Amino acid sequence: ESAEEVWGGTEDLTSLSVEELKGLMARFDEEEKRISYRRRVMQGRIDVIRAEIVRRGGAVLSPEELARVLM
Amino acid sequence: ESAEEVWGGTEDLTSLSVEELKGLMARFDEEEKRISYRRRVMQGRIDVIRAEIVRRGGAVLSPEELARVLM
Ligand SMILES: [Mg+2]
Ligand SMILES: [Mg+2]
C-alpha cells in the first residue's frame, strides 16, 4: 500500500503499471527531499561543533582527527 | 541523555564540555552517514523508475515532467 511495500513486493519492473511508476516516483522524490533536509541539518551540527572545538585550540586533537571525525 | 535532547536543550555552545562535544560530533557524523546512504537509495529508485518510464515511451509524460518529477 505504501510506496515502500509496493516497491519491495515487486520482482519485475515491467509488471508495474505507468500509474504505479508515476505514483512511486513522486513518493520517492518526496522522501528524497525530506532526507536531504535531514542530511543538511546533520552537516550543520557537525559544522558548528568542529568550529567550537577549533575555537578552543583544537584540544589535543590532531587536524586529521578533526577532519575525519576519528574519536 | 540522548544526543537529540542534550543538543536541543543547549542554549549556549560554550557551556558544553569538550567530552560532550566529541560525543555529539561522533553521533551526528554516523547519523549523517546513515542518512546519506538512504538518500542514495532513494536516488537509485527514482533513477530506476525514470528509466523504466522512458523505456516504455507512450508520451505519458513530457521530458520536463520526467525531469522535475511533475506527475
Ligand atoms: Mg565549518
Ligand atoms: Mg539510469
Author numbering:
A (entry chain A), B (entry chain B): 28 to 98
Sentences from the paper on this structure:
The RsiG–WhiG cognate pair is the only known example of a σ–anti-σ complex that is targeted by c-di-GMP. Here we show that the same σ–(c-di-GMP)–anti-σ switch has been co-opted during evolution to regulate distinct biological functions in unicellular and filamentous bacteria, controlling type IV pilus production in the genus Rubrobacter and the differentiation of reproductive hyphae into spores in Streptomyces. Moreover, we show that the anti-σ likely originated as a homodimer and evolved to become a monomer through an intragenic duplication event. Structural analyses revealed that these single-motif RsiGs form an antiparallel coiled-coil through homodimerization, enabling them to bind c-di-GMP in the same manner as the monomeric twin-motif RsiGs.
Two well-diffracting crystal forms of the RsiGRr protein were obtained. The structure of the second RsiGRr crystal form was solved by molecular replacement (MR) and refined to Rwork/Rfree values of 19.9%/26.8% to 2.55-Å resolution. The same antiparallel homodimer found in crystal form 1 was evident in this structure. The same RsiGRr crystal forms were obtained in the presence of c-di-GMP under identical crystallization conditions, but no nucleotide was visible in the structures. This appears to be due to the presence of Mg2+ ions, which were required for crystallization for both crystal forms. The Mg2+ ions in both apo structures are coordinated by D74, located at the C terminus of the E(X)3S(X)2R(X)3Q(X)3D motif. The tightly coordinated Mg2+ in the RsiGRr structure sterically disallows c-di-GMP binding. The presence of the same homodimers in both RsiGRr apo crystal structures, though they were obtained under very different conditions, supports that single-motif containing proteins can form the same antiparallel coiled-coil homodimer as observed in the monomeric twin-motif RsiGSv. Importantly, the finding also indicates that c-di-GMP binding is not necessary for dimerization of single-motif RsiG proteins. Interestingly, the regions that extend N and C terminal to the homodimeric RsiGRr central coiled-coils adopt short helical structures, which appear to depend on the crystal packing environment.
